[model samples]
Target: KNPISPTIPLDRDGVFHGFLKLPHSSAWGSVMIPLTVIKNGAGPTALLTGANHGDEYEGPVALHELAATTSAEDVTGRLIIVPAFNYPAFRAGSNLNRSFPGRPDGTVTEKIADYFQRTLLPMADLAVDFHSGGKTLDFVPFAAAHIDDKATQAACFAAMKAFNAPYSVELLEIDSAGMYDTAVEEMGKVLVTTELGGGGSSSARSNAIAKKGLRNVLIHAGILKGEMQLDETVNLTMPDDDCFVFSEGDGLFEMMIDLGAPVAKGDLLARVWPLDGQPPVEYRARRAGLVISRHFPGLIKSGDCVAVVGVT
Candidate 1:
């Protein structure tokens, strides 16, 4: 736990730096949110954030590792990183991103992001927010982008291509309150978000992929130079249509199948009952789709999110 530093400093090279303080216990408990930058000579800066959900640990670790390893010589345009976007939720291992950008004073998670929106984003050219579902939800490893803007859409396509994520979701098109997208639009910054990992570990496999992608983007954005080593493989292609799946009822749940498998409508997505096998209680998919994601191991009720269907 690196205590919040008093001052954010820049090296002899043109790099901007700062720390966002998110107290753990009291309003004064100090934990640092560090930001780094690489001058683009005269280009816009890119803002990148991680750990918007505490359970999604890989983002923070990746950025922290990058902070110690990257320098201006390897960078170009400015960059801003907020590794811990949701401080309290991160500390407590909660899924705060589920709560959206969060209320300015509603919860710790909200306050943390609010602080960033007010302080850090102003000095950025674009922003990238990293995230992953909590323990209860396992992500298919994808990038969430707004498909509306031509420039943003192109950038989104490039970003997904650069990351090579197997499962990409257009969340903005799916109708979000525009927390991240809205903030970026209002702030006039190019911002994007990512799903990193699902389990307890902060340094998930995608962490390396994300880290590499960051460096590649930096280079592509003219913020860095020299060939960036990339795998160009390891992508698991899934349809963008299966972003979210809504259930018909709220009841006990039993996973009837595996992930990444194809299933048709009226197929066994999962079993749901009122309690211990109540007859009048049941659930089924009204349309055909693939099993992109499903419940891990637990009982569920009606109106619960059962599984995601990958439909064209």
Candidate 2:
């Protein structure tokens, strides 16, 4: 392992900065990932992270505020907070959450991912990595857990309930080859992820949801002391690939469905108007479900995901 160290003591209650040493760069010798550990006593450790994908703002906002406003005197266990897990990608304002199980001798993004997969993930009893749909889509704020592993699934779901987002999703990701979520679950650790409000920015409502959900998860994990301040969360599921809708042609997309709306198998979901003079092509749903997420931009390319339909 390349020598990566923290500037702050993990066993103590205080704010610290640290970096996972990366290969030499022209601009700087190494990259920095800001970390904070707040510990008061012996209790379960909870790993809280934000900005797995650079553009997702709710996690970063909530976690940064927590790091600034909270201290060791306020907790029973360790709270390891990394406000921007993928520092390079976050600095570039792009996606790195998908770059998992990364290489030790690889690009900047991959090396960072490698550090987390090898060193960071195994250190915690439970973890929460925050996310949103990014620039292309917007989702009704939800806490998600995959159903791949039964035991981990139950644990993740319990944490999701503790999070109490506007929606709780049992997600079936279209692809799961190299995800941090999969890595954590394979190790038998409880993990909770989120898809808060997206469209490349955050709302006050979404930020509030992120903040409260994080505290609830910490308390639920027995690392913090508090009663859960929660709201009713709607339960939703993405059963299979049929839940996804993709654009068949390059054009300006006109969505016929709205987020949280119920749909039938044959429901008209969207229309793609060719930038040229060609006629618009209408798209239909392949399964009966609810519209949980939709594309944000007006212009979409062929093979782009137009919408995601979930079921209760």
Candidate 3:
């Protein structure tokens, strides 16, 4: 467990566990940000990061579990584990690091993001940016990649299969100009930023599923071997097409489906009710696909996306 000094230059990676300094006031200060990495080889490296949106907990716990148990023998290539990516958000309990690649002369959060884009990410061949919608929104766990090339699709598919999420999504806009996604994609690197449980909850079941999938991938990539099922025997083998469901009106959101529930076209997915909770303003369809994302089973304002249904 290596302790990190904020003012010191850190360039090596080998199970470094430490904290960074934060100026709290003129005479006093504080420190946060727990980072752990396991790098055993000098080949292609991959980074698994979590808690970029601090309020979400599964990513951090999952990564921590792996870092603590997976020994140097189990990890091949370079593995960088950052348990908390957004310290300010974690400290203050919010998810507004959207202002990334921040100017050195800008807000503290932005400067931190700037450090990642300029320093850490450049040293990575691939990265997994873990997340959830903080506490306010719930997310159906899935992997996303910018669909532009075969390698990108291959990497995204590798991650999707590794995580074994029932569904996956794609979005454009590469280059880490702001967020991890843009930067990783721009570098033509394999990367995935995820979303999971909400309301400050860490879904242990889901994290377990994620850990297994990732381990499988590492074995297949030849980054590690032994005790890994590399054949098609354990694959999902289901149809690849999924669905999407959108909001109908702006109002309070009430979800009726869970993350893995299957629904047909024209099925009732959720309803947007008036603020008074008297009558619903719009009842939307479950759509022609499976419900990929849903609310945290609570109240939400109108026009906000209540859930996502990935259809065939």
Candidate 4:
């Protein structure tokens, strides 16, 4: 059996702050990730986590505030908050998915995540894993759920709408093989993921969205005692492959359409000015939709994603 366990009570809890004491093989010895559990009485268990990708800040910032402000008296059942989900890499200033800290053989990322999947996730009835576009991309601030089974979809989407970001949608991941979303859904629990904003940081509005969404989700899950506050949200979906636009050459990026702009089929979306003084490569929308996401750097690389259009 794994020696690692919560330093605080996972079952009977009343505003306990502790860590998951995972012993590392190296003299590095032990890894302690911050964990807080607030339990008042009997109800659902909600796990709130952020920084799944490391560079993203909306989740961590929002969750940090939630953990600080929330008290056991305000909770219905359990509230487990972990601001930095990938604590190892988040502390090291590296993107978790891109540069995993450990080697492939008995990699640290895999080992740590296995414990979460097998031990932590099973204890929760609902979970919210926050995400943003990071330094490379920007988003329109949406909360999303992926539909699998009818029962799962019903609970997941309901919790997603409860998040009530500026936009709500069903996310279609290009790949879902190894994802926290897939893990939670596979367990048939309610899961809500969000892309609150991007560009490697948070703004006042984006952070507010994430913070409010956190409280609303707790209320929606019936784990926190509060009224569900909401804001205007547009529903969007990625209908097919045509919704994506990719860069074909390395050059300076010029976006013609801003996020949330209505896009018509055949409309020019962006351009790439080549460094060689050659003609620019033009990118266009293949279908009618809205500009939901775009590359957020001044330069673009060949094969990089340029834009994503979401149908309303």
Candidate 5:
């Protein structure tokens, strides 16, 4: 049996709002995940999800607005908008996007992942899952996709170009085993994720980028009828694992470089002042590139990702 009880008709021309009810405790036996479906004709299906990590607000803002304003007459195929995919994590303000392809017989978060992996994914021709640096980090707003199968890679890149964020990235995940990106790609479906501005909140620029990019993608995917609102996008690539720099010790982190700043090999990225009052530890770049992401919080923990530099 399907764990999500969607009130919308997946097939037909109309706008329907519903919820994905997951069993919970206390007086309320279930937690409802708000979702929407907008279909016009027989064309294609696109799944737009946000708040995969609770702290990222750009996606939620853009997608919720789309769900509310987009009408059936405006669509060509279908639009499945789950503004908050990880409802529990989003509610609890936790990171849950990495825990993808989740276990059916697992925790609430895992169960939610499992539901999408098994149910919603099969119904879509393409999917866009949004993300950002969250509370600990901030990014140079970009649309990203993994380097995978040729067909899937082409589709992803096409959408990335269509969305036309300020930056476009060829993401290389350090650990790609259980991610939703892997799940969708494995099924031969096109999936594009994004990293907009961060610091646990939304920005006027980031929100505008997200909203415009989403409509561009929908139009490109034949799910909506319109011309792509074009924008200049810088192409970038994360060639390998060396693009990232992690803190070795916990302390207050001072960044010498900011996002979008250029860096070369051996350039100091940041320094950490240890709690023990020893000498500050310096983090330097291993490659020459632009700073794509940086830790935002004042305090840093050991093993936390301090900075990510990507090649142009």
Candidate 6:
């Protein structure tokens, strides 16, 4: 077969592959964001998108497979799989994820967000967006949920559990502006996200975790039929600033503790060795918990989230 793409017709009763067309300019202008829709009959619609950042591959790899392998007959409802949600970011990210309800008159990323806010969101009953540590960080693969309206909260929680990564988190993040998570929660739908490992790439375990997790979510959504292949997912939390470790100095880091290891208060977590051979500065835990994530890169800078400690 030639490497040419397939033409998807939306009104058909099967798998439809197409692009969310966005314009670039007057001269040779456009960004064709890819989207795959698999529909069979009347049922709940699950919106699945991944690779919010270009650096993360587990989501893309898993999602790409889902698009290629899944048949319309295999699904009772619609599975809108956008493997690369932020077409631009997944390709200059660090923005699209936070650019929800974006302006149509704004930048390319903004327009994409605007589409999600206006177009894709209305049709989505539940949004399962994927993420990972990306280039700057690495983590114990986990899926997370946020506290929301009691009804919304419960649904999100159940789906989060269904994803069933090795670790589960009730992430109390700094609920920032334009976040897709907030967008979904505010819209009164379910939002299940994950940190499927990172460091800008994917591992065998990470990819597997992501693939199974995505399937689990669809099954949990009742759109895909199957028993959730689940395991004991360690429950964790990010209750406050105490759960996070930030770096104040810059340089090569001396990671003193291993990821997923338990640490007590004041336990040395890492050291930043100055480039010029100065006495390395020490960083320690302020609370007792397991190290959930660590700065993946060797060289870090001031204000970097060097490590994250998750508690039960």
The candidate that achieves the highest lDDT relative to the unseen native structure: 5
Q: How does each model score on TM-score?
A: 0.73, 0.90, 0.77, 0.92, 0.90, 0.92
For residue 89, give model 3's deviation from the true position in Å: 5.0
> Distance (Å) between predicted and true CA of 188, model 5?
1.4
TM-score of candidate 6 to 2 decimals: 0.92
Selected candidate, larger lDDT, 1 vs 6 = 6
Please list the residue runs of candidate 2 whose C-alpha ends up more than 4 Å from where it truly belongs after superposition: 21-28, 87-111, 172-175
- The models' CA-based lDDT, in order, is 0.58, 0.80, 0.60, 0.81, 0.84, 0.82
Once fitted onto the true fold, the runs of candidate 3 whose alpha carbons sit more than 4 angstroms away are 1-14, 20-31, 89-96, 149-151, 172-177, 229-254, 272-278
Model 4, stretches more than 4 Å misplaced? 26-28, 90-106, 172-175
Residue lDDT tens for model 6, 156-180: 8889989999999996452577887
Write the candidate numbers in order of decreasing lDDT: 5, 6, 4, 2, 3, 1
Mark the regions of model 5 whose C-alpha exceeds 4 Å error after superposition: 22-28, 87-111, 172-175, 275-279
lDDT of 4 by residue, 143-242 (tens): 9987874467888888988999999989645235566666776677788888988888899999989988988888888888778888798999997989
Q: Lowest-lDDT window of 10 residues in candidate 6? A: 1-10
lDDT (Cα, tens digit) per residue for candidate 5, span 6-106: 55566768998887776645556777778888988788999988866788889999988999999889988889988886646444255345557777777
How large an RMSD does model 6 have? 4.3
For lDDT, candidate 3 versus 5, the one ahead is 5
Cα lDDT tens digits for candidate 3, 22-135: 554364655566566666655666667776665777777777777687776666676666776765644324422565655555566665666566667787777777777666
Error of 6 at 58 (Å): 1.0
What's the C-alpha lDDT at position 181 in model 1? 50
- Candidate 4 lDDT score at position 48: 85
